[PDB]
Paper text:
Although its sequence resembles invertebrate LHs, L230 has >35% homology to vertebrate LHs with similar predicted secondary structure and solvent-exposed regions. Our findings reveal features of the L230 active site and dimerization interface that are conserved in human LHs, show that L230 dimer assemblies are stabilized by Fe2+-binding, and demonstrate that L230 has telopeptidyl LH activity and promotes cancer metastasis. Collagen-like proteins and collagen-modifying enzymes have been detected in numerous pathogens, including mimivirus, and here we showed that mimiviral L230 has telopeptidyl LH activity, increases the formation of HLCCs, and promotes metastasis in an orthotopic lung tumor model.
Fe2+ is coordinated by an active site amino acid triad (His825, Asp827 and His877). Tyr814 and Arg887 are positioned to bind the 2-OG C-5 carboxyl (inset). An enzymatic activity assay employing bovine skin collagen substrate to measure L230-induced conversion of 2-OG to succinate showed that activity was extinguished by mutation of Fe2+- and 2-OG-binding residues but not non-conserved Ala879. The L230 LH domain formed a tail-to-tail homodimer (889 Å2 interface) through loops in the DSBH core. L230 dimerization forms hydrophobic contacts between a leucine (L873) and an aromatic pocket formed by three tyrosines (Y798, Y801, and Y831) on the opposite subunit (inset, c). With a buried surface area of 268 Å2, the L873 residues lock into the aromatic pockets on adjacent subunits. L873D mutation caused loss of L230 dimerization and enzymatic activity on collagen but retained wild-type activity on a synthetic collagen peptide, suggesting that the mutant protein’s integrity was intact and that dimerization increases binding of lengthy collagen chains, which leads to increased apparent activity. A deep U-shaped surface cleft created by the dimerization was flanked by the active sites of each monomer, a unique architecture compared to other 2-OG-dependent oxygenase structures. Surprisingly, dimerization was lost following mutation of the Fe2+-binding ligands or Fe2+ removal, and dimerization was reconstituted by adding back Fe2+, whereas mutation of the predicted 2-OG-binding ligand did not lead to loss of dimerization, suggesting that Fe2+-binding stabilizes the dimer.
Author numbering:
A (entry chain B): 683 to 750, 767 to 895
B (entry chain A): 683 to 748, 768 to 816, 822 to 895
The structure:
Amino acid sequence: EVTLYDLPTRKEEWEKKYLHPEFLSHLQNFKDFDYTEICNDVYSFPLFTPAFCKEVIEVMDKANLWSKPTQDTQLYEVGLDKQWHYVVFNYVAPFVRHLYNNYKTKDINLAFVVKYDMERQSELAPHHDSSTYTLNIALNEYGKEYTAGGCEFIRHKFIWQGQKVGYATIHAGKLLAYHRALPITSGKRYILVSFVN
Amino acid sequence: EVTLYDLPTRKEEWEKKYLHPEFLSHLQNFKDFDYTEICNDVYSFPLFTPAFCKEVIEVMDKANLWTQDTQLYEVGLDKQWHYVVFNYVAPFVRHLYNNYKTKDINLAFVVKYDMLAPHHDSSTYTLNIALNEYGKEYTAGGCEFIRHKFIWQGQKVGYATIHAGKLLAYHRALPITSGKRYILVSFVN
Ligand SMILES: [Fe+2]
Ligand SMILES: [Fe+2]
């Protein structure tokens, strides 16, 4: 069976297993793609399947390379950098052109999985991202595996919580999307974050 | 007696002759600064005096080093512009855009339109200053913010427009129908 690492060697099997059917079916026509503008210039949309999120979490938990300050692990620390590069420049980049007036994706700054839990507490200060746009994918289920959490978009005066498994949030990195993460109060929360220039 | 090049050696006199009084008198308190949000997250505000704009054009017309443009370093004004951005513009950017810290300057140049594709800028934010008078020295012209669906025409002399460079402010210049149009543009990261 195809794994997370078999992209693009087994690309069509990879897409059917790991890409959300709605996003894959609209790769060449995002006009009718069911995405939501939760606040000005910030969009939520399905991207990956639950199997993608579960397997990403399994790889990260088994590797146990979390930083000892938020608890995260870079995708390249588990050998997924080339697969993530293919994902960004073939799947996400066409959607970014549709959302943001044909903006051309240049390069990837960072990509990592963040693990919020009750054991480690950290300051979640407001900040801008070191990116042109930021991709945030929810990897586990709100309410079932954690409570509270989310993200406050300070400039928009909008709090985004309860993101669905496999659904992504995209927003500007600098200047116009000042934001802070909000702490969980229960369980564990995994997200995939990527800073793209 | 003071010239464009006397910053920051003669800073106090440079500010009075070249910085717009409304901007100069609100450097430490931008809460009462009378700026206009022409469209979402795009702000127009007074920045420079008519003497600054006329002298900048005279430097560029004399140099004749000509998008037909001339970079500020080609006329020895890059250091003066760096002081302007980090000491005057950067505090205003923090007030407008949630304390965003200006990192560095990519480009600074004067554009001359005489007798225009949509694009993103190569910058975090872009500064656009009208250098000569709409209706007197040129007609029509201006800018369209495509994502905002907003036509912006008739910018006053010395007034600046600030907007995001990448992603969120797809724009294009509008053609003029007569005369010449000078603008000072800076791409800031
Ligand atoms: Fe962030
Ligand atoms: Fe431009």
